[PDB]
Each structure stands twice: as C-alpha cells, then as structure tokens.
C-alpha cells in the first residue's frame, strides 16, 4: 500500500478544481495535500521540499504543465518525483510531448474518482510503492 502520509501538490488555475482534487485525495486516504495556483507557485513550493506526488493541470498562467514538468525533471533533487497530468483536451501531440518529458500519468477532464484512483494505483505500482 502507498504511504498515507505522502505529500501531494495539486496545481491548477481554478480553485474549485483544486478543492475537488483535494477532496478526492482525502476520500482515497491522503490528507497531506497542498495547492498551487500556477507553475511558478508550484515550483516555489517544490523548492521547499517534502512533496512526494504532483497533480498539475496542463494549461496554467505564466507556466504550462509541460514547462513545469520539464523544470522538475531538469532538477536532480526532483527528477524522480512523479507528476500526474490533468488536461481538458487530450491531443496526441501534447500527450507524446508530456511522455517524452517524463510524465508519470495522464488524466482527461471530466473524470471520475474511480479513474483517478486507478491512475494513482498504476503510478504507485510502477514506482514500487
């Protein structure tokens, strides 16, 4: 089983979506969840450290999800940190670019709690958690 004290960073431009994701994570047993409004704030909070999983939106102001993922992978201290990508449009080119950047998973809005739980379980199994 995955560690229930794992710290999650939810990054999205909409506060309501972040609250929904936090509630879904709480229903799954994860209570250590922090929220970020854009890529810059997400990177600033990542520089603090202590996070074990990232859920980030694709299109965000001042930094999109792809650039944030590339910056995370470029950092040695956070290159192995799993990142979950949530988007509104599942274009093949964007998915391929994210996979080349090192995305751990992909979620398409709208989605159900079952899909999110399945994605988290698959990511944890791939990482051996």
């Amino acid at each position: 089983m995955a560690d229930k004290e794992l710290k999650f960073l939810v990054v999205d431009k909409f506060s309501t979506m972040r609250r929904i994701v936090r509630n879904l994570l709480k229903e799954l047993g994860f209570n250590n969840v922090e929220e970020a409004e854009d890529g810059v704030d997400a990177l600033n909070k990542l520089q603090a450290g202590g996070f074990g999983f990232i859920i980030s939106d694709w299109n965000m102001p001042n930094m999109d999800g792809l650039e944030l993922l590339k910056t995370i992978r470029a950092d040695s201290a956070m290159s192995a940190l799993p990142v979950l990508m949530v988007t509104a449009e599942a274009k093949k080119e964007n998915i391929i670019a994210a996979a080349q950047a090192g995305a751990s998973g992909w979620v398409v809005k709208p989605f159900t709690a079952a899909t999110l739980e399945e994605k988290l379980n698959k990511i944890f199994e791939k990482l051996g958690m």
């Binding site: 309501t16 979506m17 709208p110 709690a113 079952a114």
Partner: protein, 83 residues
C-alpha cells in the same frame, strides 16, 4: 441500474451539475445530474453555436448565465417528470 450510493458517487464525473429535488409527498431528496457536456451543448445551441467547436471542460464553476440555462433545463425536466 441499482447499486449502492457510494458506487453511484464514485462513477460520477467531476466537476458536474448536481440538482437536489423533492418528490412530494414521498420523503427524501432526489438528484438530477446534468453532465457538463450537455450543459455546454445547450449553451451552444441557445447562443447560436454552430456546434463545430466543442467546449472542453476546464473544471471551472458554471457562470450565472450558464446557471440560468441549467435552471431552465431543470424546470423543463421537472415538468416532464411530474407529467
């Protein structure tokens, strides 16, 4: 399909428009669930949308005009259900 409430909640896409209704004289609260895709299609049709450019759900809250459209759709649905 008949299933426990938690299973029904687990299979509802999020975010979504949830409407609480009452079926008098029966006791309890009913739910009318409107998917964001249907709401966007109705908004497109009402405001001259050609339908060639579907709107992707970004996870944002419905606007006041969208809320009024949902209102109208729900009123029609409740009238049909009652009839």
């Amino acid at each position: 399909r008949i299933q426990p409430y938690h299973e029904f909640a687990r299979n509802l896409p999020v975010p979504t428009n949830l409407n609480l209704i009452h079926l008098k004289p029966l006791r309890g609260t009913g739910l009318v669930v409107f998917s964001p895709s249907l709401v966007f299609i109705a908004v497109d049709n009402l405001f001259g949308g050609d339908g060639r450019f579907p709107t992707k759900v970004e996870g944002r809250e419905f606007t006041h005009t969208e809320q009024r459209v949902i209102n109208r759709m729900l009123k029609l649905a409740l009238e049909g259900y009652s009839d």
